[PDB]
Amino acid sequence: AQYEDGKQYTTLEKPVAGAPQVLEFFSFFCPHCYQFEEVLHISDNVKKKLPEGVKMTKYHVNFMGGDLGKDLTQAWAVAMALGVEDKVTVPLFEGVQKTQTIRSASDIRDVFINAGIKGEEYDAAWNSFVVKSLVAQQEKAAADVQLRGVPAMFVNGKYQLNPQGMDTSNMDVFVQQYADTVKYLSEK
């Protein structure tokens, strides 16, 4: 075929019922994730090709960066609750991997303050039970699919993108092939 299990994607040996339609995992410590976000704009190009009515979900993971890694998952929970994903994603990546000015929860907080979220609003979210359960959700979804690596994308809790099996000679071609694969998997 043109799309083959084990080539552009793999199939989960045990599928996850009730999973989000398009599910993406990342870490702000993850170098390919930085590329995926900053250089390739994967999430965005996948969305542009997804059919009408498909929701896109993106979660942070704990297994990179130890203590700060967990801080970052709670902060991403705060970002999701407040709806400010688009204003903090880039400074968080650059703060962790480019400038290396993020070393503590307080430095993570600074990124949100500088992005214009009010201190009081951030600290209130940070400590809220709604954020606690959003953390729980992020962990549960990663736990459900055996997750040991990022970046990772899952479609309908049954298919996992396999970017290793696509060509990287051209960055634009890589992205399109990636997005088309998600669309194909979506329609399956």
Domain-by-domain residue ranges, the chain? Answer: 1-188
> What resolution in angstrom units was achieved for this structure?
2.1
Q: Are 110 and 91 in contact (CB under 8 A)?
A: no
Q: Rounded to the nearest 5°, which phi and psi values hold at 3?
A: -115, 120
Q: How many C-beta neighbours within 10 Å does residue 159 have? A: 22
Query: Would you state the structure tokens that stand for residue 22, as one six-digit string?
Result: 């398009």
* Residue 5 per-residue DSSP state: B
| Cβ pair 171, 36 in contact under 8 A | no
Q: What are phi and psi of 26, to 5 degrees?
A: -150, 175
Strand partners, 155: 22, 159
DSSP-assigned beta bridge partners for residue 58? 24
The domain 1-188 having CATH identifier 3.40.30.10: the answer here is yes
